[PDB]
Amino acid sequence: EPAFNYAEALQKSMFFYEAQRSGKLPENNRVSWRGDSGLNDGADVGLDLTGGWYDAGDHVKFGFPMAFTATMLAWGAIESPEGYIRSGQMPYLKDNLRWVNDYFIKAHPSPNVLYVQVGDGDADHKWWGPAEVMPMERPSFKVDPSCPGSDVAAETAAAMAASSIVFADDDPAYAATLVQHAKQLYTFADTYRGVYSDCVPAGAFYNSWSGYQDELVWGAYWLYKATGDDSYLAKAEYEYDFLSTEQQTDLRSYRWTIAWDDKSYGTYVLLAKETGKQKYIDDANRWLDYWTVGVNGQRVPYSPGGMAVLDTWGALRYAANTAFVALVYAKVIDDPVRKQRYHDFAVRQINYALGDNPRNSSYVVGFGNNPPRNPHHRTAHGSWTDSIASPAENRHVLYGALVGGPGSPNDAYTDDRQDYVANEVATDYNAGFSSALAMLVEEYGGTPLADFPPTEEPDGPEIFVEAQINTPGTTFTEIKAMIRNQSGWPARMLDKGTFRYWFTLDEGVDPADITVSSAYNQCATPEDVHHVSGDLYYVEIDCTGEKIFPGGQSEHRREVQFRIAGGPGWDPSNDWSFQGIGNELAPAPYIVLYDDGVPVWGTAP
Ligand SMILES: OC[C@H]1O[C@@H](O[C@H]2[C@H](O)[C@@H](O)[C@H](O[C@H]3[C@H](O)[C@@H](O)[C@H](O)O[C@@H]3CO)O[C@@H]2CO)[C@H](O)[C@@H](O)[C@@H]1O
Numbered sequence: 025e026p027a028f029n030y031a032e033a034l035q036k037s038m039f040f041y042e043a044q045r046s047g048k049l050p051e052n053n054r055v056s057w058r059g060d061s062g063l064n065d066g067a068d069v070g071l072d073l074t075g076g077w078y079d080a081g082d083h084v085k086f087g088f089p090m091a092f093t094a095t096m097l098a099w100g101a102i103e104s105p106e107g108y109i110r111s112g113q114m115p116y117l118k119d120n121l122r123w124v125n126d127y128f129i130k131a132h133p134s135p136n137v138l139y140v141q142v143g144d145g146d147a148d149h150k151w152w153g154p155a156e157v158m159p160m161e162r163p164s165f166k167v168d169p170s171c172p173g174s175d176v177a178a179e180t181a182a183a184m185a186a187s188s189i190v191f192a193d194d195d196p197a198y199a200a201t202l203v204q205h206a207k208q209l210y211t212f213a214d215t216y217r218g219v220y221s222d223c224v225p226a227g228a229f230y231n232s233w234s235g236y237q238d239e240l241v242w243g244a245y246w247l248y249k250a251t252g253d254d255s256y257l258a259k260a261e262y263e264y265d266f267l268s269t270e271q272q273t274d275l276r277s278y279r280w281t282i283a284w285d286d287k288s289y290g291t292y293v294l295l296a297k298e299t300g301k302q303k304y305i306d307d308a309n310r311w312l313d314y315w316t317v318g319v320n321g322q323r324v325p326y327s328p329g330g331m332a333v334l335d336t337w338g339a340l341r342y343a344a345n346t347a348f349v350a351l352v353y354a355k356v357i358d359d360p361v362r363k364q365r366y367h368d369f370a371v372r373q374i375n376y377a378l379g380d381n382p383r384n385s386s387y388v389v390g391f392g393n394n395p396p397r398n399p400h401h402r403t404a405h406g407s408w409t410d411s412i413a414s415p416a417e418n419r420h421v422l423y424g425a426l427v428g429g430p431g432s433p434n435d436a437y438t439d440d441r442q443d444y445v446a447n448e449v450a451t452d453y454n455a456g457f458s459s460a461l462a463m464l465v466e467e468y469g470g471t472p473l474a475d476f477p478p479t480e481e482p483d484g485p486e487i488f489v490e491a492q493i494n495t496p497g498t499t500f501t502e503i504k505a506m507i508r509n510q511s512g513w514p515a516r517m518l519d520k521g522t523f524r525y526w527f528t529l530d531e532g533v534d535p536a537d538i539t540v541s542s543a544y545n546q547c548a549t550p551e552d553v554h555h556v557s558g559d560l561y562y563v564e565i566d567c568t569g570e571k572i573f574p575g576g577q578s579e580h581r582r583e584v585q586f587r588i589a590g591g592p593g594w595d596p597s598n599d600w601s602f603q604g605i606g607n608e609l610a611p612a613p614y615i616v617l618y619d620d621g622v623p624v625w626g627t628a629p
Pocket residue numbers: 228229230231233234277280283284285286337338
């Protein structure tokens with residue numbers, strides 16, 4: 025039996041990617057707390073750029089890492105389809121890759137034009153709230169011959185190509201369509217050379233630090249596998265000699281790892297696996313050695329607990345990416361000592377993330393012992409006041425998400441949501457992690473959970489009305505009502521709401537003498553009352569036009585003060601909506617709130 029149920033982890037990892045979806049979600053939606061969002065994406069340029077994945081705990085759709093995530097997720101399903109089948113997650117992986125690839129198609133309106141971003145990084149990060157009510161404008165950026173971007177283009181090609189191998193047998197027509205787009209994106213990237221971050225305002229988040237030389241080899245190798253065209257392998261091997269060397273030596277870089285920006289390290293193992301040439305084997309060896317025993321006395325930092333800490337930001341992601349590529353190389357190299365080393369290194373790094381560490385706690389939200397409960401994620405938090413501090417705990421469990429984890433070699437970590445350096449999540453954090461789990465499920469096994477995902481239930485009323493007696497009176501009843509929208513299953517707009525306050529006409533009160541006034545009302549103040557039947561009448565407050573959404577202090581509520589004066593004889597004790605209303609603001613169950621005519625709160629007479 026496995027040390028950790030790698031099949032449950034993998035199963036929850038695919039749920040992650042479904043909670044990161046954007047655009048109009050399907051009927052089969054498994055995440056009950058997610059709704060339609062980013063529905064006007066592309067409007068500014070006249071295209072439909074809806075769909076895709078939000079990058080991290082934010083809502084900007086960054087195309088560079090989103091492409092990488094797709095290639096790593098595919099690569100792992102090509103190395104170990106059996107792993108995805110055993111855990112029962114193959115139909116989900118295919119559902120996720122299809123979701124992101126459909127977007128890469130939408131975003132490629134013509135051969136040499138690719139949309140690589142939707143959303144401004146600064147405008148987006150200034151607001152903390154659910155993605156279903158994003159109030160800011162989201163610009164769309166692109167790269168074309170006028171301002172090229174070989175790195176993001178060759179990666180989107182590598183992604184669509186690597187994915188076509190997954191759909192090849194299931195949907196041969198769809199597979200062909202991806203290979204086609206992929207060819208055009210690689211030609212565009214080779215013909216028009218450039219760094220995408222010089223053309224789109226993403227340099228402060230996903231800047232092209234390594235350049236495109238790595239994505240030209242990476243992109244070619246994948247078109248080679250998808251098409252079988254030997255010219256592509258020729259192209260990959262040729263471009264391989266221009267990869268970044270290190271500091272002063274002619275040795276190719278070996279001190280980092282493969283991540284959304286540098287694919288050099290993947291090509292070391294990929295070409296070595298394909299050709300078997302000593303040239304590549306040496307590189308893959310020097311790289312993976314620096315992460316295990318070391319080279320020339322230098323070794324990646326390690327914490328007393330057994331974690332490989334490469335950098336502060338997203339440490340576990342880096343160690344997870346190496347753990348996957350190490351398991352793939354462990355199968356192609358013949359050396360028994362090296363094979364054992366790389367394999368053991370990989371299982372240890374994944375086991376650390378799943379719970380085998382000094383804290384004995386998991387680092388995958390929703391999985392294991394003492395998992396994180398508050399990652400830096402806006403929609404999972406469910407804030408309704410534009411605050412990262414309120415509510416205290418995230419209102420949703422983002423099952424499957426791998427957090428940053430310890431950023432220093434001391435195994436320390438604090439579940440603080442305001443720590444985007446160690447407690448943030450992202451599509452590429454689970455990319456290499458997922459590929460490893462698939463490789464570990466095939467080898468060590470595991471069993472998925474039958475009843476998954478659990479169905480969450482709201483933490484109280486979502487859209488309701490609170491009320492209280494503003495000023496005591498015997499000839500009038502002055503109420504202070506407050507509409508609230510603190511929804512999160514999913515968060516929704518309330519732009520066409522009205523509410524009724526029922527009352528019973530009393531002896532002596534001429535309904536013609538009833539007046540409804542206010543000294544403060546953010547909605548409309550009515551002139552007359554409406555007769556239902558008999559002595560039953562109602563006052564209707566109209567708030568249609570006001571956008572009440574969970575996204576700010578004054579944005580989520582509307583205060584309505586209104587006095588219903590009837591003159592002497594007025595008696596509120598026999599009024600329906602008066603039941604329960606006191607001197608403290610508390611939900612009023614007998615004031616009915618309607619959304620476009622449909623009741624959402626309260627019970628009518
Ligand atoms: O020069 C050292 C290696 O750096 C690699 O680029 C990394 C950047 O140096 C690093 O600052 C950046 O950190 C990102 C992080 O990856 C991302 O998850 C987070 O959201 O934002 C951080 C800041 O943008 O990561 C990149 C990629 O690992 C080079 O790619 C590598 O060649 C080079 O040796």
